[PDB]
């Protein structure tokens, strides 16, 4: 803990702040083994995460990996993170979410991966993550979302703002959603044609929804909030 | 020094087996008092009983979960003490079985849910509870009661107001959320029959996401062109920004790009069979403004025939020529043609005469010659000039 890192005994758990110390590897520091804790690892230059790099963090509640310039997660890196609940992967350089990337977790219910350049998620990526309830993926490169990604989880918060989405189909992607309390689609290149109807329809059936969905395409419907729009305005 | 004095005393509770009961106790005095929880004068010690202190040190909440009956049914006492004095207060816990729950005992119809709020944004935890009589709703966070006594504060509780054929609505409204607001919230419904807890609901605090809006900007501003009459050319225009801007082409006032088919972020104007020069405006517009940038198409005409040369200075083996460009547009340079008068061969050319004067040297003595002037700019080689005869 103390030598190359700063630890604050918080009221409930232990806060370990190894933020911004320019670590390229997690080999150096010995975490506590029986005490529950949180680990801040922002601002540390590691290009990649290696298989089974994390193994002795049996009991870590939250882990921050932002501003690390992460490029890849070799198959099953988080091998030992048995009891991890909250994970951040923000502001890095990740393009693909392999289906076996999150191998280790059974207990995780929070996942933040914003600003990361993700162009294509794979379908089975979030499978075997039953406990997951929060998924944050805003400001990435998502053109389209492989069907049945969300079929095995029932999250309540999904943030897809600032991505590169033009259409979102009911069959597969959407039928699993609907159990959500919050969803965000705010800054996306929505192409408002009849081909965008399912989403629209699904937005009436869904409850507890808040947010704006403005037509990027076409010029006629530019700026118009789809929720305000009608099925005839679209055909 | 002053002896202890209670500012908050616990009240008798009737809970349901498997559920939760909490007792709250707070005291003041000088020095600050400590609090203990007893049963029958012996300090409580049980895996299901936990005591959670207030951060200020004023009190403690004794929480029992899961409730067991008759196990937990009892009188408990809160004792506050310092070296100046001691004070105690008793309270009763009752625990009912689900199969002897009365009609009217509060129910949780809907409970607070996992919620994620951005820092500085408002978070609202919600609860719907019903019962007979219509119950009061209070809130616990991380096992301590929520304080909303101060109506004038950051955390507010809201009314329903009067229900009704459905349950009573309770709202816990947390303005200007901060990391410390993160935690495990439970809503609690209480009436004269007893007390019921909701399932817990976690609140998460995510770092504020700021919508990066950027007014339009000519990523690729159109660059000017000059070409020969008909004459094609592709001029390209590119705009960027958030939101992404529509790009149209204009010829002065008229729109070239039809309105209902108008590209985003990039528009390349295809110009065919160019006839005359033209200023061409390119307009990019977002919801955050309108910018425009012109493209200078011009039609250049390769040189006219130069104005006939004149003999200014003639020597036995040299002949100086002074002419006019014979052009409206700048002439990049001139080429002089020379040959003998009775000669019937291709003209000998002298190149690169950047001025309208040049001394052709190397000529034979007493020999006639015929001279011509050819103009050149960037476009092409203009026709020659009407010849001058001399000796
Ligand atoms: C984890 O601890 C085990 C204990 O022997 C050790 O062998 C291993 O190298 C450690 N790995 C890391 C990444 O700390
Ligand atoms: C928008 O949708 C129409 C038909 O649905 C399609 O022809 C067009 O290419 C789409 N535009 C974009 C930018 O996706
Ligand atoms: C303009 O672009 C079109 C599209 O490919 C091309 O066929 C044409 O040759 C281009 N003309 C010029 C002058 O670049
Ligand atoms: C084009 O605009 C320029 C000024 O930018 C002006 O001097 C010129 O006369 C114009 N020419 C034509 C053909 O519109």
Numbering used by the authors:
A (entry chain B): 29 to 263
B (entry chain A): 28 to 418
What does the paper say about this structure?
Presynaptic type IIa receptor protein tyrosine phosphatases (RPTPs) (PTPδ, PTPσ and LAR in mammals) can induce synaptic differentiation by binding to various postsynaptic adhesion molecules such as IL-1 receptor accessory protein-like 1 (IL1RAPL1), IL-1 receptor accessory protein (IL-1RAcP), netrin-G ligand-3 (NGL-3), neurotrophin receptor tyrosine kinases C (TrkC) and Slit- and Trk-like (Slitrk) proteins. All Slitrk members except Slitrk3 can induce both excitatory and inhibitory synapses, whereas Slitrk3 selectively induces inhibitory synapses through binding to PTPδ7. PTPδ expressed in the developing brain consists of three immunoglobulin-like (Ig) and four fibronectin type III (Fn) domains in the extracellular region, where two splice sites exist within Ig2 and between Ig2 and Ig3. Peptide insertions (termed mini-exon peptides) at these two splice sites (referred hereafter to as meA and meB) generate splice variants of PTPδ.
After optimization of the length of PTPδ-ECD, we finally determined the crystal structure of a complex between Slitrk2 LRR1 and PTPδ Ig1-Fn1 at 3.35 Å resolution. The asymmetric unit contains one complex, where Slitrk2 LRR1 binds to PTPδ Ig1-Fn1 at a ratio of 1:1. PTPδ Ig1-2 forms a compact V-shaped unit, similarly to LAR or PTPσ Ig1-215. Ig3 is spatially separated from Ig1-2 by meB. Slitrk2 LRR1 comprises a central LRR with seven parallel β-strands flanked by N- and C-terminal caps, which are stabilized by disulfide bonds. The concave surface of Slitrk2 LRR1 surrounds two strands in PTPδ Ig2 and meB (234ELRE237) with a buried surface area of 644 Å2. Asp167 and Glu215 of Slitrk2 hydrogen bond with Arg236 of PTPδ (the third residue of meB). In addition, Asp142, Asn166 and Asp187 of Slitrk2 hydrogen bond with Arg233 of PTPδ (one-residue upstream of meB). Slitrk2 LRR1 also interacts with PTPδ Ig3 with a buried surface area of 450 Å2. Therefore, the present structure clearly indicates that binding of PTPδ to Slitrk2 depends on meB but not on meA.
